[PDB]
PDB file of C-alpha atoms in Angstrom:
ATOM      1  CA  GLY A 234       6.237 -12.880 -29.570  1.00 52.67           C
ATOM      2  CA  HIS A 235       7.684 -10.811 -32.423  1.00 54.42           C
ATOM      3  CA  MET A 236      11.239  -9.878 -31.431  1.00 54.88           C
ATOM      4  CA  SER A 237      13.608  -7.713 -33.469  1.00 56.55           C
ATOM      5  CA  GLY A 238      16.678  -9.623 -32.251  1.00 58.34           C
ATOM      6  CA  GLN A 239      18.218  -6.848 -30.147  1.00 58.50           C
ATOM      7  CA  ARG A 240      20.389  -7.021 -27.045  1.00 54.94           C
ATOM      8  CA  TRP A 241      17.610  -5.763 -24.761  1.00 55.77           C
ATOM      9  CA  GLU A 242      14.860  -8.158 -25.929  1.00 55.12           C
ATOM     10  CA  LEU A 243      17.227 -10.931 -24.876  1.00 56.47           C
ATOM     11  CA  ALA A 244      18.524  -9.664 -21.550  1.00 59.11           C
ATOM     12  CA  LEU A 245      14.772  -9.484 -21.004  1.00 57.61           C
ATOM     13  CA  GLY A 246      14.589 -13.152 -21.978  1.00 57.08           C
ATOM     14  CA  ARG A 247      17.369 -13.871 -19.490  1.00 56.64           C
ATOM     15  CA  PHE A 248      15.246 -12.145 -16.835  1.00 54.07           C
ATOM     16  CA  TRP A 249      12.063 -13.978 -17.842  1.00 54.30           C
ATOM     17  CA  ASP A 250      13.799 -17.361 -18.078  1.00 53.17           C
ATOM     18  CA  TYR A 251      15.103 -16.849 -14.537  1.00 55.24           C
ATOM     19  CA  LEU A 252      11.598 -16.075 -13.259  1.00 56.44           C
ATOM     20  CA  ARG A 253      10.278 -19.294 -14.815  1.00 55.58           C
ATOM     21  CA  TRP A 254      12.778 -21.231 -12.700  1.00 55.66           C
ATOM     22  CA  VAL A 255      11.578 -19.359  -9.606  1.00 54.95           C
ATOM     23  CA  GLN A 256       7.928 -20.152 -10.356  1.00 54.86           C
ATOM     24  CA  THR A 257       8.649 -23.896 -10.141  1.00 58.10           C
ATOM     25  CA  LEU A 258       9.194 -23.390  -6.379  1.00 55.87           C
ATOM     26  CA  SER A 259      11.378 -26.491  -6.124  1.00 55.08           C
ATOM     27  CA  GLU A 260      13.647 -27.298  -3.182  1.00 56.84           C
ATOM     28  CA  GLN A 261      16.481 -25.298  -4.748  1.00 57.72           C
ATOM     29  CA  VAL A 262      14.033 -22.421  -5.205  1.00 57.95           C
ATOM     30  CA  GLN A 263      12.613 -22.947  -1.706  1.00 58.29           C
ATOM     31  CA  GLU A 264      16.197 -22.909  -0.416  1.00 55.83           C
ATOM     32  CA  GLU A 265      17.410 -19.978  -2.527  1.00 59.46           C
ATOM     33  CA  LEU A 266      14.340 -17.852  -1.733  1.00 57.83           C
ATOM     34  CA  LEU A 267      15.259 -18.009   1.960  1.00 61.53           C
ATOM     35  CA  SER A 268      18.529 -16.276   1.066  1.00 62.95           C
ATOM     36  CA  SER A 269      19.064 -13.274  -1.228  1.00 63.11           C
ATOM     37  CA  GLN A 270      20.784 -15.003  -4.161  1.00 64.07           C
ATOM     38  CA  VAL A 271      17.605 -14.959  -6.272  1.00 63.64           C
ATOM     39  CA  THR A 272      16.919 -11.265  -5.671  1.00 62.32           C
ATOM     40  CA  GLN A 273      20.567 -10.321  -6.251  1.00 63.18           C
ATOM     41  CA  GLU A 274      20.641 -12.183  -9.573  1.00 63.24           C
ATOM     42  CA  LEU A 275      17.189 -10.968 -10.622  1.00 62.83           C
ATOM     43  CA  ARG A 276      18.259  -7.387  -9.880  1.00 61.51           C
ATOM     44  CA  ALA A 277      21.334  -7.934 -12.056  1.00 62.71           C
ATOM     45  CA  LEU A 278      19.189  -9.133 -14.963  1.00 62.02           C
ATOM     46  CA  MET A 279      16.788  -6.208 -14.479  1.00 61.62           C
ATOM     47  CA  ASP A 280      19.656  -3.704 -14.538  1.00 60.62           C
ATOM     48  CA  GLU A 281      21.257  -5.429 -17.542  1.00 62.95           C
ATOM     49  CA  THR A 282      17.962  -5.277 -19.445  1.00 60.64           C
ATOM     50  CA  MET A 283      17.393  -1.591 -18.679  1.00 60.51           C
ATOM     51  CA  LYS A 284      20.907  -0.506 -19.682  1.00 59.60           C
ATOM     52  CA  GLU A 285      20.713  -2.307 -23.031  1.00 57.34           C
ATOM     53  CA  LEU A 286      17.236  -0.860 -23.589  1.00 60.39           C
ATOM     54  CA  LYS A 287      18.496   2.629 -22.715  1.00 60.74           C
ATOM     55  CA  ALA A 288      21.329   2.295 -25.237  1.00 60.22           C
ATOM     56  CA  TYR A 289      18.907   1.020 -27.888  1.00 60.11           C
ATOM     57  CA  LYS A 290      16.522   3.962 -27.502  1.00 56.50           C
ATOM     58  CA  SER A 291      19.486   6.349 -27.729  1.00 53.10           C
ATOM     59  CA  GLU A 292      20.569   4.836 -31.053  1.00 51.45           C
ATOM     60  CA  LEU A 293      16.981   5.095 -32.325  1.00 51.19           C
ATOM     61  CA  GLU A 294      16.608   8.763 -31.316  1.00 52.05           C
ATOM     62  CA  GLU A 295      19.097   9.687 -34.093  1.00 53.14           C
ATOM     63  CA  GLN A 296      17.685   8.137 -37.266  1.00 55.18           C
ATOM     64  CA  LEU A 297      16.214   9.204 -40.620  1.00 54.62           C
ATOM     65  CA  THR A 298      16.238  12.890 -41.507  1.00 53.90           C
ATOM     66  CA  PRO A 299      13.313  14.897 -40.138  1.00 54.54           C
ATOM     67  CA  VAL A 300      11.124  17.505 -41.749  1.00 58.48           C
ATOM     68  CA  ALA A 301      11.000  20.090 -38.918  1.00 56.96           C
ATOM     69  CA  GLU A 302      12.597  17.764 -36.327  1.00 54.62           C
ATOM     70  CA  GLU A 303       9.494  16.630 -34.448  1.00 53.61           C
ATOM     71  CA  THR A 304       6.677  14.345 -34.941  1.00 53.40           C
ATOM     72  CA  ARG A 305       8.622  12.312 -32.367  1.00 57.36           C
ATOM     73  CA  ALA A 306       7.778  14.267 -29.200  1.00 55.30           C
ATOM     74  CA  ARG A 307       4.498  12.427 -28.637  1.00 50.38           C
ATOM     75  CA  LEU A 308       6.022   9.165 -29.868  1.00 48.00           C
ATOM     76  CA  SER A 309       9.197   9.512 -27.791  1.00 49.76           C
ATOM     77  CA  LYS A 310       7.150   9.989 -24.613  1.00 50.50           C
ATOM     78  CA  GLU A 311       4.881   7.009 -25.307  1.00 50.25           C
ATOM     79  CA  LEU A 312       8.067   5.008 -25.873  1.00 48.33           C
ATOM     80  CA  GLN A 313       9.559   6.332 -22.629  1.00 48.59           C
ATOM     81  CA  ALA A 314       6.311   5.433 -20.864  1.00 50.98           C
ATOM     82  CA  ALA A 315       6.651   1.861 -22.140  1.00 50.59           C
ATOM     83  CA  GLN A 316      10.326   1.716 -21.154  1.00 49.97           C
ATOM     84  CA  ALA A 317       9.468   2.852 -17.626  1.00 50.23           C
ATOM     85  CA  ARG A 318       6.567   0.386 -17.592  1.00 52.29           C
ATOM     86  CA  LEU A 319       8.921  -2.519 -18.330  1.00 55.99           C
ATOM     87  CA  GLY A 320      11.309  -1.507 -15.551  1.00 54.31           C
ATOM     88  CA  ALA A 321       8.407  -1.085 -13.134  1.00 53.77           C
ATOM     89  CA  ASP A 322       7.211  -4.626 -13.902  1.00 56.01           C
ATOM     90  CA  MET A 323      10.683  -6.018 -13.209  1.00 58.48           C
ATOM     91  CA  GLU A 324      10.881  -4.080  -9.927  1.00 57.58           C
ATOM     92  CA  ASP A 325       7.518  -5.512  -8.843  1.00 55.32           C
ATOM     93  CA  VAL A 326       8.848  -9.055  -9.299  1.00 53.76           C
ATOM     94  CA  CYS A 327      11.958  -8.323  -7.230  1.00 49.52           C
ATOM     95  CA  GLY A 328       9.935  -6.527  -4.559  1.00 48.77           C
ATOM     96  CA  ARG A 329       7.492  -9.425  -4.307  1.00 47.27           C
ATOM     97  CA  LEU A 330      10.271 -11.990  -3.819  1.00 50.12           C
ATOM     98  CA  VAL A 331      11.814  -9.749  -1.147  1.00 50.68           C
ATOM     99  CA  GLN A 332       8.520  -9.808   0.756  1.00 50.07           C
ATOM    100  CA  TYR A 333       8.410 -13.593   0.399  1.00 52.32           C
ATOM    101  CA  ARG A 334      11.897 -13.946   1.890  1.00 50.70           C
ATOM    102  CA  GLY A 335      10.597 -12.208   5.008  1.00 49.38           C
ATOM    103  CA  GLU A 336       7.142 -13.801   4.918  1.00 46.73           C
ATOM    104  CA  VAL A 337       8.693 -17.283   4.998  1.00 46.21           C
ATOM    105  CA  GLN A 338      10.219 -16.136   8.308  1.00 46.93           C
ATOM    106  CA  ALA A 339       7.515 -13.741   9.552  1.00 47.28           C
ATOM    107  CA  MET A 340       6.838 -14.515  13.226  1.00 49.88           C
ATOM    108  CA  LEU A 341       9.685 -17.027  12.858  1.00 49.31           C
ATOM    109  CA  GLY A 342       7.963 -18.508   9.818  1.00 48.65           C
ATOM    110  CA  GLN A 343       4.519 -18.994   8.285  1.00 49.83           C
ATOM    111  CA  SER A 344       2.639 -21.814   6.552  1.00 50.61           C
ATOM    112  CA  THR A 345       4.681 -22.208   3.366  1.00 50.34           C
ATOM    113  CA  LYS A 346       1.927 -24.235   1.663  1.00 50.56           C
ATOM    114  CA  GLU A 347      -0.513 -21.318   1.529  1.00 46.33           C
ATOM    115  CA  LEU A 348       2.450 -18.935   1.265  1.00 49.14           C
ATOM    116  CA  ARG A 349       3.774 -20.539  -1.924  1.00 47.96           C
ATOM    117  CA  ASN A 350       0.243 -20.644  -3.359  1.00 45.05           C
ATOM    118  CA  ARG A 351      -0.285 -16.892  -2.967  1.00 45.27           C
ATOM    119  CA  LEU A 352       3.196 -16.203  -4.348  1.00 45.92           C
ATOM    120  CA  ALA A 353       2.698 -18.482  -7.364  1.00 47.17           C
ATOM    121  CA  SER A 354      -0.485 -16.685  -8.416  1.00 49.28           C
ATOM    122  CA  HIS A 355       1.078 -13.267  -7.814  1.00 47.21           C
ATOM    123  CA  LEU A 356       4.165 -14.201  -9.846  1.00 46.37           C
ATOM    124  CA  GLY A 357       1.928 -15.460 -12.650  1.00 47.60           C
ATOM    125  CA  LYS A 358       0.120 -12.118 -12.755  1.00 45.28           C
ATOM    126  CA  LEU A 359       3.400 -10.186 -12.785  1.00 44.55           C
ATOM    127  CA  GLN A 360       4.693 -12.538 -15.493  1.00 40.47           C
ATOM    128  CA  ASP A 361       1.622 -11.869 -17.648  1.00 43.25           C
ATOM    129  CA  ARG A 362       2.076  -8.124 -17.137  1.00 43.59           C
ATOM    130  CA  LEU A 363       5.769  -8.369 -18.036  1.00 38.70           C
ATOM    131  CA  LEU A 364       5.056 -10.312 -21.232  1.00 37.79           C
ATOM    132  CA  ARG A 365       2.324  -7.945 -22.443  1.00 38.12           C
ATOM    133  CA  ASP A 366       4.240  -4.763 -21.608  1.00 41.98           C
ATOM    134  CA  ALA A 367       7.312  -6.144 -23.381  1.00 42.98           C
ATOM    135  CA  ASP A 368       5.180  -6.533 -26.510  1.00 44.43           C
ATOM    136  CA  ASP A 369       3.764  -3.032 -26.029  1.00 46.37           C
ATOM    137  CA  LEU A 370       7.315  -1.679 -25.788  1.00 45.97           C
ATOM    138  CA  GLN A 371       8.056  -3.379 -29.115  1.00 44.88           C
ATOM    139  CA  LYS A 372       4.997  -1.642 -30.578  1.00 45.63           C
ATOM    140  CA  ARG A 373       6.143   1.746 -29.263  1.00 46.98           C
ATOM    141  CA  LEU A 374       9.577   1.099 -30.780  1.00 45.76           C
ATOM    142  CA  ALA A 375       8.054   0.313 -34.181  1.00 40.98           C
ATOM    143  CA  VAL A 376       5.775   3.370 -34.074  1.00 40.44           C
ATOM    144  CA  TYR A 377       8.742   5.550 -33.103  1.00 37.56           C
ATOM    145  CA  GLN A 378      10.902   4.297 -35.981  1.00 35.61           C
ATOM    146  CA  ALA A 379       7.950   4.793 -38.363  1.00 35.06           C
ATOM    147  CA  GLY A 380       5.937   7.820 -37.231  1.00 37.12           C
TER     148      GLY A 380
END
């Protein structure tokens, strides 16, 4: 909820805004989930978010003068843990939609009514994990810049 207005927080928003369109499961989504256009574009947004985040952490790892270099070792790892957590959440969303592309054609197709219901709940859980871990990453960034 509290963004610092960086390039990564927003490529993240471009990823999250795309997932909201997928969760509507409209005809265009039902059509585009059969193909790989969604997963290709979601992978692009995931990679774009992680490269901007990587460049942001690099700029932050060279800030105010230290006294003895490190109180950052513990803080830099907890920040790296949150960075890897965010990327793992975005991989889980892509991996789930890849399974759905095959599940909609498993044994030449399955019941899409129950199939879209299980996917919608699973996407909602992944979305809630992505939103919370994005806020935790912001907390780890603030702690890192502070001490």
